Structures are given as C-alpha cells and as structure tokens.
Design an enzyme around this catalytic site. Structure first.
Site, PDB file in Angstrom:
ATOM      1  N   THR I   1       1.063  -1.287  -0.203  1.00  0.00           N
ATOM      2  CA  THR I   1       0.708   0.140  -0.115  1.00  0.00           C
ATOM      3  C   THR I   1       0.909   1.296   0.169  1.00  0.00           C
ATOM      4  OG1 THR I   1      -0.287   0.863   2.141  1.00  0.00           O
ATOM      5  CG2 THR I   1      -1.030  -1.392   1.727  1.00  0.00           C
ATOM      6  N   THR I   2      -0.118   2.173  -0.222  1.00  0.00           N
ATOM      7  CA  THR I   2       0.996   3.821  -0.527  1.00  0.00           C
ATOM      8  C   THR I   2      -0.120   5.095  -0.407  1.00  0.00           C
ATOM      9  OG1 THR I   2       2.684   2.916  -2.028  1.00  0.00           O
ATOM     10  CG2 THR I   2       2.690   4.709  -1.388  1.00  0.00           C
ATOM     11  N   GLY I 140       3.708   3.475   4.062  1.00  0.00           N
ATOM     12  CA  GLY I 140       3.380   2.225   2.852  1.00  0.00           C
ATOM     13  C   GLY I 140       4.570   1.986   2.378  1.00  0.00           C
ATOM     14  N   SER I 141       4.435   0.240   1.816  1.00  0.00           N
ATOM     15  CA  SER I 141       5.482  -0.003   1.427  1.00  0.00           C
ATOM     16  C   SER I 141       6.145   0.033   0.369  1.00  0.00           C
ATOM     17  CB  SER I 141       4.890  -2.273   0.909  1.00  0.00           C
ATOM     18  OG  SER I 141       3.776  -1.545  -0.220  1.00  0.00           O
ATOM     19  N   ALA I 180       2.698  -4.547  -4.037  1.00  0.00           N
ATOM     20  CA  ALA I 180       1.580  -4.639  -2.300  1.00  0.00           C
ATOM     21  C   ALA I 180       0.943  -3.916  -2.934  1.00  0.00           C
ATOM     22  CB  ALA I 180       2.333  -4.927  -0.995  1.00  0.00           C
TER      23      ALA I 180
END
EC number: 3.4.25.1
Lengths: 222, 215, 215, 215, 222, 222, 215, 215, 222
Positions: I1-2, I140-141, I180
């Site tokens: 997620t970001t 996030g990732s 992701a």
C-alpha cells in the site's frame, strides 16, 4: 468447511456445507453453518465448530438485545461493527486454535434501490470488514476454489433460483477440490444448507430444492 | 420510626401511581392484549421482555423504563446461559418483585410504579396466559384474567369484571378494554399483543391504520 | 431509645405476619405433611431444600423466597463440599436463624416471615421427623409434632392439639390439617409431603386430581 | 446522649439475659460439670471448644452459637499454628471478652448472652479447673468454684453458695447443681463434663440412661 | 516409604515402615507414617516426609473441627471427599516436588454389616479416590512389591492377628526389594508401626507384637 | 476406557467398561463411568478418572440445583448447554492434562414422538456439542473400534434388549482392539455397567443381565 | 417526613428555574430553532450533542454544562460503538431522564436545570423534528411544536401558542420566537439552528452580521 | 431542611468573603492588571495559571490556594495533553465553577472564596481581555471591564464604574485601581499584570522600586 | 500500500491506492485509505487494514469530541499531539503485527500566510512526528519509490491540478515497483482516491478527474 454468499437482483443467498472433520476423521455429516441471525441477516462462521456456534448465538442475542432495549433495530453498519468487534475480541483465542471467520449476508431495508439492497460483508482475522462489490464471497478452507468457481459462474446469476444453483455449484467445486468440505451425500440424502434473503426477509431454503439442484449438477458433470 | 417511615413511603408511592395513566392487560384467545392510554408516540409503557414474555407498566416513566431494561437484561442473560425456552414469565416476575421490594425498603425514594409481566404459551401449545402484577413494595400477585394499573383502577376494574369475555376475539377484546379504560381514541392510545400464534417472538405492536381498523 | 426501636420493629414484623395465610406442618407415619392456604398455583410457599429437608414459610413472599433460595444454595454447597448425607435440617435451621437475626437487627426493614424446616429420616432408617420453627428475629424452636405459622395461629394450634394423633396416615393427617386450617378446597390449598419411603428425594407435591382423591 | 444510650443498651442486654434458662458450671473431683435446663435435644447450650476447654452460654441461642463457632475456629487455628497444648482457657476467655466488648459498643443491638469458659488440666497433671465468666459488655471474671448464668441468678447462686462441696464426686455435684437449678428430669436437662481423666479430649455428654441412672 | 493396608473380618489394619531417605542417604530411622486421624480412621501418607506430616495434621484438624462445629462427625464419604480435596489442592506442589500420596483405612460404624465395615480408600495424584474391594492396598515406592506380596498372602488373613502378620510380611517384602523402604532393624530394635481399627476404635499396635511377628518372619525366611 | 450410547425405538442405552489404567499398569477393575444424572439423562465421561467423577457429581448437582430453585427441570437444550459450558471451562486443565470428554444420553419427555425421544449428545474437545442422528456414539480411547462395531451391528437394534446386547458387544470389540478398555472379566465376575432410559425413566441395568449377554457374546465368538 | 423532603426539594429546584433566563426551541421548515436570552458570548446555553441532535438548557450554568458534557460523552460512545445513525434524540433524552431523576433523589442538592433535546431528520429524509423536555426530577415529555424554558414560561408559552406557525421560514420563526420571548437585539441573544439540510452536522450558530440581517 | 441548610450555608460563605481584603482585576491597554490590598509579602492572592491566564482570589487563604494549585495542575495537564495554545481562560473558569459547586453542595463547610480568572490575547493577536468571576456557589459570570472581589465591594465597584477608562495606560489604570480600592500605600499592595506584549508568559509582578515609580 | 501527500501553493493534496493483500494473494481492490478527518485535515494510514480503519475512526471521533466539548476546534499542533499519542499507545500491539503508520495532511487556518498554510506531518514507528518542509511525503510499502518519484516531479507542482497529477504519478510509480500497491486498474475502472484541502476546506476528488489523469500518465508511459 466452506460458506459461500452471493448477491442476485433483489436479494442475497448464503449456502454452506455440512462436513466437520477433526484432523482427517469425519466427525460430523449434518452440521449447519448458515444461521438466520435476524429477519434480514444471515451469518455463517467457518473455522472451529464450537466457536462458530457460540459466535452465532452471541451475535443473535446481541442484535435482539439491542432491538428490544432501544425499540428499533440496528442499522446494517451497526451490525457490521458489532460482528467486527466480536472477531477482534476473539483474535487472542484465535491464535490459540479457536478461530472463527464470519461471513455476513444481509438485505439493507433502508437502501434507496431495493434491487441492489443485498450486502455481503467479509471479515479478516484482524477484525476488519469489507463490503464486497464483486457480488460474491466465500469463507472456509475451500473458499479459494468456491470463489474461483463463482468468478466464472456469476454471469448466470439472474434471479434467486439461478443464484442458489451457482451457490450449490460453488460448494460442489469446493468439496471437489478440498477434503474438509463435504459434497452432496446422495447416499445419506444430506445436502448443503442455504438461506435466501430478499425484501420479504430471510428464509431457510427447503432441502428438496437443494437436492434437485445438487442432483442436476451431478448429472451435468457426469 | 420504621413503621411511620414505611407508611409514609407507601403513601408517597401510592399517590405517585394514582396520578398516572391507566394500563389494562387482558387475556384473549390469541394471547394477551395490552392497552395503555399514551399520548406520546415515543415514550412507551408497553414492551417486549422475551419471546413470549411482555411487559406493561404504570407510573413514572424513567423508573419503570429502568426496570424494563433490567428485566430485558436478565431475560437475555438467562436465555443465553441455559436456553430460550427456559425463560418464563414467573422468573421475571420474581426478579421484579425482589428488585422492587429492595428499592422500596432501601432507596432514598421508593419507585412509584406498578408492573405487569405477561406470558403466553409457546407456538403449537395450549396454556392459559399468565399475568403477574408487581406493586411498588414488591408484592406479587397472579391475576388469571386481567390487570389494571395506574390512576383510579377501581371503576376500570369493576367495568372489566362486568364485561370480561373469556376466549374473545382480538377486536372484541379491544372493544371491551377501550370501553373499560374510558370509564379514548386511536391517538393517545398504545396497543400491543403477545400473540400465541407467532412462531418465535409473540410481541407485536398494533398502531396506526391497523389499530383504527381494529378499534 | 434502642428498646423502643426494637419493640416497634418487632411489632411491624409481627403485624406483617398476622395478616398472612397460615401454614401447618405436621409429622405423620410417612414423614412430614405441609398444608398451606395458597390461592395461587405459581407462588409456592412449600419447597424442597434438600433430599430429606423441606421448607415452609409464611409472610411476605419475596422475602421468604429470598431465604428459600439462600437455603437451597447453602444445602447444595454443603452437600457438594462434604457429602449428601452430611446435610441435616438442623444446620439449615441454624443458618436461617443467623440470617434472620442479622436481618432483623441490621436491615432497613425486618423480614415479616416465619419459616419451618422439616427433616425426615433417610431411606431404610427409623427416626422421628424434626420440625424447626424460625421467627423474624432469628429465634429458633424445636417442635416435636406440628408447626403453625402465619395468621392468628392460636385457633389453628388449639385445633391441632385437640385433633393431633402421632403415627397417623397421610389421608387422616391431611383431614386434621385442613380442619385445623379452617378454624379449604382443592383450589386455595397447596399440599406437599416429605415422604420417608422415597429412596433419595423425599419431597412430593400432591396437586389436582390426586389431591382431591386424597381429600 | 452517650451515657443514656450506653445505659439503655446495657439494660436491653440485661433484660434479654434475664428471660433465659439458667446454666451452672461447677468444679468437681474429676473436672468440670455443666448443667443447664434445655428442653431441646438439638439446640445445645453446652459445647466443647478444645481438648480440655469447654463452653457454656445463656441467652439468645443464635448469638452465642455464633460466638461458640468463633471460639472453636480461633482455638483450632491457634492449636494448628503453635500446638495443642499452647491453647488454654484464658486465651479463649480473652478473645470472647474482646469480641463481646466490640459487639456491645459497635453493633446495632448488643448480644444478649453470658458465656462461661472452663478449662481442666491435661492428662496426668494436677491443677484446679479454671472458670471464666464473660458478660454482654465484655467484662471477664475468674470464678474459683462455680458459675451461674441466665435467668434469676441470685437465688440459685445463694443455694450453690450454701450447698457447694469441694472435691465432690460427679453424683453429688450433679445433685447439688440440679437442686440449685430447681430453686427437673432427664428431659429438659442438658448435662456435660470436662473429664480430666480422659487422655486427650475431656468433653463428654451425659445423656440418656446414663444421666437417669446417675441423677 | 511403603504403607500397606488390608481388611480382615471385623476391621482393618494399616502398617508402615520407618525409614526416611534424602536421595540415597538414610536420614531417619524411626519415622512414623501411620496416624490415627480420628477414633475410627487411620491415614498413611507416602511421598515427601514434610508434606506427609503436614497433611496428616491438617486432615486431623479438619475432621475434628467439623465434629466440634456440627456436633456430629463426618460420614465416611465426607472424610474421603475432604482428603481428596486436599490431594487435588496439591498438584502445583507435586509438580514443584512437595508431593503426597495418602491411603485411608477406616471403619464405617454406620455400615449395616459389622464384619464388612472395614474400608480402604486409595488416592491417585490427580485427586481421584477409589474404595478397594480386593481387600488390600499399598502406597509408596515399594507399593508394587507389597501389593504383589499381599496378593499371594491374603488368603490366610482370617482375624486381626493374621492380618497384622500379613501386613508386616508385605512390608518385609517391600523392604527386601526397595532400598527406600526400611526393614525390621534387629540391631537398633526399630520395627514397622501399625494401627488396627475395629468396632472398638483405632488403636496403635504395641511395638512388642510387631517385633515378635517380624522375628518370626525373619526366622522363616532364613 | 470406552463409553457407548445408542438409541432404540422407545429409549436410549448407555454402557461403559470398568478398567482404569495408570500408563500400562491396571489400577482399577470396577470403575463405574456411567452416572444417572437425573431421572431422564445419564452421562458418561471418558479421560482422567478424577475429572470424570468430579464432572459427573458437579453436573448432577447443577441440574438438581436449577430444578429446586425454579420449580421446574431444565429443558434438554439447557442441560446440553450446561454440560458444554463445563467442557469449555475445563479447557485449561485439559491442556494441562486433566482431560474429560463427556457423552450424554437422554429421554426428551417434551418430544413430539415418544419413540424418537431418545437423544445422544457428543461433546468435542472445545466444548461444542452435536445431537447424533446416526443413532450410536462412543467416547474414550477405544471409541473408534466401538463405533465401527456399532456401525455394523446397529441394524439388529429393535428394542431395549437388542440395543443392550449391541452396546455390550461394541464394548467387547473396543476391549478386543484396545488394551486400556476392560473386557468382561469372567474370573472376577466384573462386567460393563449399563443404564437404560425410557419413558418411565433411567434405570441401572442389573449385573446379571449384562453377565448373561457377555457370556453369550463370548460363546458366540469362541 | 419524606413527603416534606421531596416537596421542599421540588420547591428548591423550581425556584432555581424561576429566577433564570428563558429559552425557546421551535420546529420550522428547515429544522429546529433555538433562541435563548444570553448576555454572554462565552457561556452558551445552546449546544450540539450529535450530528442531528441539539441541546438546550435553562437554569444554573455549571449543572447543565456538566449534563451537556455527559450527554456528549454518551452520544460519542454510542455512535462509535455501533454507528453514527444509531444515535437518536430519544436515547439522549432517556439518559438525561435517568441522570436527573437519580440526581434529584440521591444528591444533596437537586439540579436547577430544565433540558430540551432536539432531533432533526437525516439528510435527504423527511421527518418531523422531535423535541423532548426533561425536568429537574427526571420527567420527560414529547413536545410536538415547541419547548419553553426558564423564568415565567406561562406568558411566553401562551404567546407562542397563539402565534406559532408550522413550516415557517427561518426569518418568520426567529421573529416569532423573539416576540414571544419579550413577553432583544443581537446582544443578549444566543441563536442556533439544527439545520435539516446540512449533509452530516446539522448544528449551526447564527451570530453577528448574519443574525443582524436575519433579525 | 435542604432549603434552610443551603440558605444558612450561603450566609456563612458570604459572611466569610465580606470580612476579607479586596482585589480588583481591570483590563487596560497592555492587558489585565491585578491589584490587591495585601500586607503579607509572602502569601500571594494573585498568581499565574498559564501562559496567558492569570488568577486572583479573595477570601480564606488556604481554600483559594488549594483552588489555585488545582487550577495550575489542570492547566498544565491540559496543555501537555493537547498543546499550550489549547489552554484558555474559559476552560479554567468552567473547571473552577464545577469545583466550587461541588464544594458548596457536598463539603461540610463551603469554601469562602471569590475567584477571578483573566485571559489576555496571545502574542501578535489583538483580542479583548476576558475576565471571569466565579463565586462560592459555583456561579460564573463574564465581566467585560473589571472584577471587584472581597470586602465591601459596592463602593469599589461604584468608583470603578465612574472612573473607568478603556485602553488606559498602565500608570493611569494602576492609579484608578488604587483610588477605587481605597474607597492605601504602595506597601501592603500586591500588583501584577497579564501583559499581552510578552512573547509567551504574560504574568509579571510589579513590586518594590518599580511599583513605587509606577504609582 | 502507498499513501502520498504533497503541498502545492495554496493547499495540500493526499492520494492513496486501493489494493489490500493477505500475503501475496490480492484480497481487496477498492480499499479507501484516505479519510477526511475534519474540514481541514485528512489522514491516511498504512499497514494493517483493520487497524487503519480503526485508527481513522477513533481519531475523527476524538477530534469531533474535543470540538463539541470545548466549543472550539483543536489547533493543528493539538491534532498532531493526539495522533502521536495514538501511535505511541499502539506500539505494543504493533509489536505483534497490528501495525499502523499514519500520514497527516492539513490546512492551518491560523497561519498568517494563506499560500503556505498546507502542512504535512509524518509519524515514525515509536510515535515521533515531523512536519515536512520539503513539501511531500509518503507512507506504505511503496513509499520509497513514491518519494523518489515525487523528488523528481515536485518542480512541476504549481496549483491543485498539477499537484494532483504528480500525486497520481507517484502512486503509479510505487505500484510499478511494488506489488503490494495497486495501480490504475483500467479493466474495472478503479483508481486511487484523493483528497484536496485548501482554504475552502477538505474535499474528495471526483473519480473522473483521477481517471483522466491516470489515463494520461498511462498513455505517456506507453
């Protein structure tokens, strides 16, 4: 175990299998996993059978308790929140093997468009919830095969009977690929249980209709 | 002095109940009918306690609403602990009697309420509905036919005694109940039934166009 | 003035006892017989405390029902802690004496109750039944033949003394008890027996057609 | 007022003990003898506290039964904590005095009891039995010869003073005590002995044909 | 440690050895392991010596306390239940090493038949209790050898004296096979202790009678 | 240990073996594992003997306590729920080692059909329960052999006598394949304990009838 | 005398309300209008409880400020626990009834407060606004048109009754409320609306130049 | 009687405040000025609550010092929990109102205090100083211009009303305040300022040579 | 997620992706990660989805609770402190895997200069917070790829439209480099959610504008 739920024009349907195993041994052949929680909501818990039954009982008691206390039933968001809080509280025991994975099916009686009033809510292990817009959802050990079957058969869903047929076929595929989910027992006459929710409420599907659907599916795949 | 104090508490509670609207709970063929003169459409003197157990009250609203919430909590806990069919109207009446006796003896102000707990038979069973009247001091009585609470209950009691018909229909019972209560209209009237013919939950509210048609 | 306070507290409890229905417990050949004038079929004044221990009470229903539940809890806890045969009627009578004394002295309002604990012999053993009477202040007495509680007890007691006979049958003893109570019918009578002929649980309710055929 | 309140409390306790049956504890050649007038065979005013320590009481039964249980608990706990021979009558008398003083000055009504604690020497030892008399307010006294509790104590005390014999046998001591109480058959008479000749437990109940033959 | 108990027509007999060892080292030579709890019951506790003495004292105190409070002694079932509760309350200490196995011999005076009124009750570590119908029981490290000796010697038990001889001989066999059990010490003159319970009550056997029986057994075994 | 229960037209029958073992050593030969909980329900608990006895006593006390307090016995569902709550509460000890798996047989006097009033409720390790529709259920270490014996013998069950014979034979098969289950001891004269529940109530089966049945089964298999 | 205690307690609370500024809440086309006589721009008698729930109070400021804080806490907890749309004005009014009844009976001095809880329909929905009045003793009433507060409410209520117009505009309602309140400029006036057309939060304060143009 | 008790309690508090030295807090061009007649140079009736919030009090020293310490603790906790700019004078005044209401109603003796909480604008902002007067019973009021507390406040208030001047200089405001407070010397005066020109902490004491020059 | 956030002259913009995974399996395709906490603040929480939603709900409730109680909204530093306290108080539960990392975007209404009233606040694992002065931030990732993309693209930001385009492009880069994070899904028409906060308040960006920007970016990179 596998519980499938899917939306159809004018409502929602929710079916579940009957097998219960402890390890590899088949300990139960007629378990019921879809509960009519209230007049417009069905709940279905996968995982440990004991935890599933006690969670269904707690959830039904909580919803009726609120309705009696405050004279008005909870909104659908309130029901989702109570279920999510129950799951989050269980998380600790769920790490100890007493896992419970709920799936919620409902009819939003306050929704503007009754043809699209069916709701499917899925919960993850951490207690979060998501309202599925794809129109179908599944929980249990065979949930992947059931979901991948419904992805290909959701086009057929046009009414309550078409949705029920796809639900039984999804359960059949899950049991075909997974040994913890029970297929239709033509020998004992045990078939998946189903609940249909529409504007008129949530009703248990009679066993004969599911028997006809299951036999038609078996003939189709023979 | 304890005797003078107890008598004065009794007078306080009795005067408080006497200046209140009247409630009638009477048994008929379909179950139990509750009729209370209630001008407000939100504050309700008649409610459901459990599947086949209903509640009526007369007096100060917040006190008997607290009692109603306590009774609902008790019934839900009892039904979860053992089973739904193990919850009876007699147990709820006993709990109410204990609670009201304790409140009368110990609290700073006694509750100015009168309660009726009604039970009907489960679905597909024959049993005369049971009506339990609980007073402000915890005195509990079994009334086989009907209960009148609040206000001047004596003319209403005499009228109901003269006009009570066993195994009457719902509409007839509504006629007799409203007539005895008048001694009003569809508005300023709250009507409910414990309906023995319901599958699981007996309680059902009859208000609006249905009530006018029935009345 | 504590003397006047206790005197008026005792007067209140005694007067509450006076305006209550009477209960008679007597010893007969088969054990103990309880007869009470109880109009209701749901609020029971006679109950089983334990296998060979029975309970009767007169006065305000909620108070002696609280006492009955407390005694049942005590008996079950004791029988589980040591053994079922280790529970006697005397221990329960002493517990009731302690409870009622503490209630009379300390509680906001004394309990207008009067209790009798009756014990019969175990199965296959010979022993005269034991009757203990406990009053509102906790005073405990042993009665060899019969106990009369509630209401004006003097006429009923006198009738019993003029008509009691040890080693009487159940039918006859019931006739004497009903006659002494009159000084009623199958309704307005609650009748039970501690039956020493039963293997484990001596309590047995005699109701309805069996009571009429025994009356 | 404090003085008035304490005096009326004292008079309440005194009048309570006045309307009670009398107990005598007197030292005879073999130990201590308790004689009481007690119609009940189950409610016992005379009991054992510990191996050589015995208990007697006069007044409201429930109150001194509670006190007796407290004393037995204290004696057993103390005998376990240190030793059986470290438990003496003086410590039990002192704990009774403390408890009764606290009850008198603090409880809603004072205990209407008078207690006697008797101790005899251990086996194979020569020592005069110790008698301790404790009153409702916690006052404790050492009596060398005899203790009289409950009822009118003046006449029986004078009769004992004129007729008490030192180092008398059990028969003569029982005759003296019974005659003093008379100023009563096997029934309505509870008799027990702290028998100094027993190896461990001195307390022993003289009942049935034994008392009839001895009396 | 070995404590044996056996029934004979008209009563019960409980005998126990005298050695206490810490590891391989003999620490005590005259330890008394059989206690007259009340007038009609005796108890013998194997295991840790400290726990044994403490438990015997606690049990006697509890029984006497009940008799003094209620004016009547406990029934035999009540005594068994109290002992079993004490045993169940020692599981944590048992895992810690402060362990105790009791054996209870009694004479039920309320039993209908006097000649069968003897009772033997055996307790396991989990707190369960068992009334023996085989007539004999043993606890301790040498309990197996003593039980197998009594299995062969129990036919010649007819009265109190022969039962006492058989108990002493079982203790002899247990000492002969288990180094933690002490036999009759003919040098120091220390012999097993014993208690006989019959209709007249529970009495400790004088050391002379057990000395004579043990000397006869030793002379027989040579 | 093995406890079997089976339904026959007009009632239920629950039988159990008598052996108690501590590892490989046979400690008890006459243990009673089937308890008449109340006039219409019997319970049998497998696992640790101490926990089994404690559970039986505590459950019977709970049922009678409720009946005395409320003046009316618990419904069958309420009894099942109380037993399930006890099983769920025993989970920490069961992980520790004090495992107790109960089996409940009952007669539902409130049933629509007296001939189908027999009820068998098996409890899983987590406290979840299931009303068996097969008509037979077994708990214990030899439960699989007993269940697979009843699977073949159940067609012969037509009344109480045939049902009792089938239960005894199932226990015999369990003892045949399992060493922790005690078979009929023709030497000591110790036989399985059986309880038969019908409309008139629950009654212990006399030892002599079970002895006759066991002797017949043994002679048939000789 | 408990009657005298309750009646002089009522006199205290009512007199406290009598010497207080007046408040008016009335239903109009856009929702609910609150108009209070408040010379202070800092201390507010009108406030917001929840998205569609508003609060008005008359009397002693600190007491009803404590009440308002408690109601906001209850509403926030209730909304977070279930959902924002599961919070209603009826629940808040019931909570205030229980709180004020308990305060009136149990506390040393009752609260000299009079409360109104107003609810409007959610966005895009039609429903008459609900107005609940809670008095110092816990009494709760459903007022369909308007609630009046503090001071002498008889003339203000009579003027409102004679001049009230259902479904009036905001200007019309404000003029009517101020005219009835007179029997006032931008100063000494606290004005707010529960505005039924706002998406989520209906409460909006009308002060300064906007209030000047509106007034 | 609660009414009599509250009236005599109010009499006690007012009598306590009347026999005390007087404090004046008045707004001027630089912020707020506190002037007290206080001979003690060690015990201070004026203190700082927070960066822009100041405290002044009249009455018994221990009581209002307890209040001052509590208010400082509340302000520091609130500033650390959220931010330093989230602490306002109104929140502190509301807390003081709640505290004094509870003290007046519940404590054995009411606090004979009269508090003023003053707030100036933050650095770089132009906002009118706000003064809150909190009385012994929890009543809280907005004073737009000045607060006079303690002693006979009528002449001082009249002098201030007649001789006030908005946006006056520090010297003019100090001289006017001293003149009104007489209606004496530089000693026996405690003077402090909430100075809106300070960057963070506005409170600043004026004593000794600087006070001499300023007056 | 970001979740990315960036300041533009006159306000702040905050965008978030739509994917939620359970391992490498995709489980959510239209998760909403950017919440309008109040009229002038938006928050976006990366990490466990359940805890993210719980945190957003709790934070909004707390801010509104303060505003109702005290009658004045919290200053921006007060809001930052409340969020930091939440993050610090979730440290123990984040050590078990229920981690949540928020990013706060706001418009300070008390700032003297309207053109520099946008604020971005980043919170680290232990509860520390920093007000970003470089003008952009991501959590996030895929946060590192999005940050490095914004580093190159931030010179193109001059108004709300270009700021939104740069935020969407940063999300595209994060999805390109990290599995992701969900990219613009043209098949189902699911696009990143965005919120723009300026002097007029915080408002959600309509999906059509973000769809247009995503299509333009995809075309440019094709």
């Amino acid at each position: 175990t596998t519980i499938v739920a899917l939306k159809y024009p004018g409502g929602v349907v929710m079916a579940g299998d009957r097998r219960s195993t402890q390890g590899n041994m088949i300990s139960g052949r007629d378990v019921r996993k879809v509960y009519i929680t209230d007049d417009y909501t069905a709940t279905g818990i996968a995982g440990t059978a004991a935890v599933a039954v006690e969670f269904a009982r707690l959830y039904a008691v909580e919803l009726e308790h609120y309705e009696k206390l405050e004279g008005v039933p909870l909104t659908f968001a309130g029901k989702i929140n109570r279920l999510a809080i129950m799951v989050r509280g269980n998380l600790a025991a769920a790490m100890q093997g007493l896992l419970a994975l709920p799936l919620l099916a409902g009819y939003d009686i306050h929704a503007s468009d009754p043809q699209s009033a069916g709701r499917i809510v899925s919960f993850d292990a951490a207690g979060g919830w998501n309202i599925e817009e794809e129109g179908y959802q599944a929980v249990g050990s065979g949930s992947l095969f059931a979901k991948s079957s419904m992805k290909k058969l959701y086009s057929q869903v046009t009414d309550g009977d078409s949705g029920l047929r796809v639900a039984v076929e999804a359960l059949y595929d899950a049991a075909d690929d997974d040994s913890a989910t029970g297929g239709p027992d033509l020998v004992r006459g045990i078939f998946p249980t189903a609940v249909i929710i529409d504007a008129d409420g949530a009703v248990d599907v009679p066993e004969s209709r599911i028997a006809e659907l299951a036999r038609a599916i078996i003939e189709s795949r023979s | 002095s304890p005797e003078q104090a107890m008598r004065e508490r009794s007078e306080l509670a009795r005067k408080g109940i006497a200046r209140a609207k009247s409630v009638v709970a009477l048994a008929y063929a379909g179950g139990v009918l509750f009729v209370a003169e209630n001008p407000s459409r939100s504050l309700q003197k008649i409610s459901e306690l459990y599947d086949r157990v209903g509640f009526a009250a007369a007096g100060k609203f917040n006190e008997f609403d607290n009692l109603r919430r306590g009774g609902i909590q008790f019934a839900d806990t009892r039904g979860y602990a053992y089973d739904r069919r193990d919850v009876t109207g007699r147990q709820l009446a006993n709990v109410y009697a204990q609670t009201l006796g304790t409140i009368f003896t110990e609290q700073a102000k006694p509750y100015e309420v009168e309660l009726c707990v009604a039970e009907v038979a489960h679905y597909g069973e024959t049993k005369r509905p049971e009506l339990y009247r609980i007073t402000y001091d915890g005195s509990i009585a079994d009334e086989p036919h009907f209960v009148v609470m609040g206000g001047t209950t004596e003319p209403i009691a005499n009228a109901l005694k003269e006009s009570y018909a066993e195994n009457a229909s719902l509409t007839d019972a509504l006629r007799i109940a409203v007539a005895a209560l008048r001694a009003l209209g569809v508005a300023s009237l709250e009507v409910a039934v414990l309906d023995a013919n319901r599958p699981r939950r007996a309680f059902r509210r009859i208000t609006g166009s249905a009530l006018q048609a029935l009345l």
